[PDB]
Structures are given as C-alpha cells and as structure tokens.
Amino acid sequence: MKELIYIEEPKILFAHGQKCTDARDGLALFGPLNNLYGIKSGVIGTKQGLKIFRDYLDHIQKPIYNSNSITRPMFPGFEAVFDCKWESTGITFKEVTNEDIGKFLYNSSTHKRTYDLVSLFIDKIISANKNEDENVDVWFVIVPDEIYKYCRPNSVLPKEMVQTTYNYDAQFHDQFKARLLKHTIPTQIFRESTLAWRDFKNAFGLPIRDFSKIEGHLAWTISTAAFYKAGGKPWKLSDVRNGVCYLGLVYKKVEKSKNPRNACCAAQMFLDNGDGTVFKGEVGPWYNPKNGQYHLEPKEAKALLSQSLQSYKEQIGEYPKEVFIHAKTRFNHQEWDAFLEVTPKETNLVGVTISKTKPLKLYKTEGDYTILRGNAYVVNERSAFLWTVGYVPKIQTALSMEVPNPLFIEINKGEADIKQVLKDILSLTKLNYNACIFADGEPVTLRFADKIGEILTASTDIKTPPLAFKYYI
Amino acid sequence: DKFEKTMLVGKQKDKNWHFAISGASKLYPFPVLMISSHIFFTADGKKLID
C-alpha cells in the first residue's frame, strides 16, 4: 500500500478577475479578458464551400445544445459568450474555382500536388492581404475533402483519375501555415466536412463525422480558436508564481535535408509586469546534426537559453528567479554544462522530463469509472507519476475512454520541489487555446512547442519566424 | 472460454476477440513486473488476423 496525494485543481482567470475551474463555463458566464470589438473575417475557398461557411457562421450565431449539458456545457452564441461581433455579413471572399483545384489535384506527384494546392490558396491570400482595402483579422481557409483525402503523405491517388516541390513537406496544414510566416497572416483551416457535416453521407446513411450529440462543443472549440486568432485573450492562469519562466523544448525531424538533423523548437511562458501572462514561442530553431542524438551542442543550447533570458529581461527588466525547462526527453550533462555558463547566479535552473512511455494504469476495484484526475504517486524526491488524463466530477466523466495512463515526471538535474513541479504542470495543462476543453492531458509548453516544431519543419526557407502562436495553431 | 467468472475469449461478429497481456520487468521504483492489456481478434479462434 502506497499513498497517493491529490493536487488541488488549478483555477484559470476570466473577465473581472473571476476564477472558474472550467474554461467553457468561465467564458459562458464571465466572458473573455479583453474587449475585441469585432472579428472582420476573410474566407477563401470554393463558392460551394462559401455557402457552407456562411450557414455554419449563422448557425453559431444562435445557441447550440449538446446531448448532455452536464458533461458538455451548451454554447450560448458567439457574441453572448465573447462580447464580439462575428457575422456572416462582412466576410471578404476570395473565390477558388473547382477547375483550378482539379488541375492541381489530379497529379501523380504527391509532393508537387500538395505544393501546387497550397500555392493556389496562398497566392490569393497574399494578393488579398497586399492589394485590397479590406482588413481581415483572420483568414478562414475552407478546403474540400478530396484535398484532405489526397494531400498528405502516404495517400495514394487512385489510377483512374490521375491525369498527369520536393523541398517542402507534403502536409497541407503544416506546409501551408509554414509558407505564411513571412507575412504573419492568422489562418484557420476548416475541412468542408468539419463544417456542416450533415451534407456528407456514407453508404449506410449516417454521416461520417457525426457531431449530432456534440455540436455545441464543436461550436465551443471552433469559436475559441477563431477568437484567439483574432487577438483575444480567452482566459488566463491565476496560480502562476512571479519570476518563473518555463520553456518547452521538443525535437522534430527534418526529412528534407540529408540526415533528419533533428530540428529543435521551444515555447515559453512567464508572468508579466502587472498580472498578464505572456505565452509566446521562443523560436530560434537550433538544428542538431546526427540521426537521433536529441541532445543539443553547447553553442545551440547557450543561444537558446540566452534568447529565453533576454525575452524575459526585455519584458520584465530583470532575469527570472526560477526557470523550469520542461522536455519530453532527458538531457545529457553537456547541455546543463552549456546552460549553467550563461545561467547567472540568482537564477535557479531546473530541468524537468515528462514521459508517457511508462505503462502504469491504476484500476479502481469497484465501478466502471477511471481514477480521478490529479492523483500523483510520488516515487521519491525527484520522480513522480501524475494523472493528468482521468476522471473529474465537473465534466461528470473522464477525459479518457479506456483506463488512462499518467505522466511520468522527473527532475533530471536542478533541485525543484516535486510537489511544486506537479502543481505547475497541472496548471500548464489548462492553457490550450487551440481547443475549448476542460483540460489537456499534457502541459501546453510541450504541445504548442510540438505544434510550432511541426510547422517550422515543413519549409526549409524559414528565417526569423514569428513568435506569436496565432500564426501557428 | 472464461476463467473464474469473467470471460477472456469472446465473439464479435465473425471475429473472435481475446484478452491478452504483455510482460516487462523493471527495477527502478521497486523490483516489479509490469503488465499491459491488449485485444486481438481471430477468424477461427486459432489463427490471428494478419
């Protein structure tokens, strides 16, 4: 028999300084932090796909109900939730003809097909950005489904319709959002099916993407992304301590250059003067040779940490007092040897390793419900288990489907209070602005860092990319 | 096809499902032997689906 300690559920902050555990309910009752007068939205896609977007936007203007309001809070309408105007009147439409789509689509080379399909959209988006009076906060890219069928790696275009670049990744989303980094255009890609899905049917007659019971949460998670990409602060953390920079470091491969070259990317969060939280990327991507080393050379590590420390000085004035570098991988000694050199005396540097590999699964003896979210089996002063995915009573269910697995957290080097470490990662699990859910299973640093790494490794010609997450998610 | 009172090998349409485990011994937290859960399906109860 070993004790399990439970971490108090962290609370996120909303308008008027009011705290609420759930983000959906917090926005539903209190609204967002800052007043965004209106979302002047631009939409690009087929004229058939414009009608779908207009219908969906008018639909989310009205309140939307889920099947079970206890498990999923209902959507009270966009402008009521967000105090922001987002109508289908006033959308700048850039038509993309179906013939031009089929001209690129029916090509044998998947790389060239993806490159041409992305180029067709980005050229029109950039032309509208540069040569049009209209100002667009965010560009909603409404893509058809045959594209998504035949615009990603390992997708075989059938012989019957094949009617007829290699420096760019074949992911439509990744390479698409990678080519707009020079122009800093916030975009939101929608599948045509993710939109009014009731049109798309299968052979049996039930829609392939059935969101009938979960239409309200679909509205919640689309609306939140649209609001964030337009420059809004949906919610904020309240338990963050003063002077703690976090940084989330993830390694992604690059298939274009010979040897994957293991590109590294970082995402940073700290507190700002006042009470505002600064959650921006720390992107200086530091390439590391060798196939699978995943340990940065001293020069790259020093450059990364110096950029992290300067990006804190220029916003607060002085160095963080406690930096908590998270990472999916444990570091070698050379990396801390690099870090400590630029690391000053007052700043305390701690490296934290988080892993989903270890297969521990606490089954409850009675009942068809999983363990409570927050339980933490502390192995010792340095290593611990944390159940970020699990049951929480407010949503009435668990965030997992089967019995979930916890997060293996350990302090490689540095000292760190392990309880404090578990008390901050659980806070990090709530700031997922790309999704309007109760909480995330992994800390947002390691997930948004992974996203920006997946975006930056799609194009080879990136230089001084934006740090804002609205250009990435 | 059931030990104790609970089934371990069952039927799903034409596929017979089986409860399976995988073994792994670890010594870091304690000397322990970790067990995982898997489900595999067979068309005749003897040959796995390839």
Partner: peptide, 16 residues
C-alpha cells in the same frame, strides 16, 4: 512474483 497487483491508496474519492 506476487499474484496480486500492487495496491495504492488515495485519500480522495467521488461518486457517480
């Protein structure tokens, strides 16, 4: 190897 799995202890519960 023990035939009964390692049992843990949580001070926090809930009900359906």
């Amino acid at each position: 190897v023990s035939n009964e799995p390692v049992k843990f202890k949580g001070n926090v519960s809930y009900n359906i």
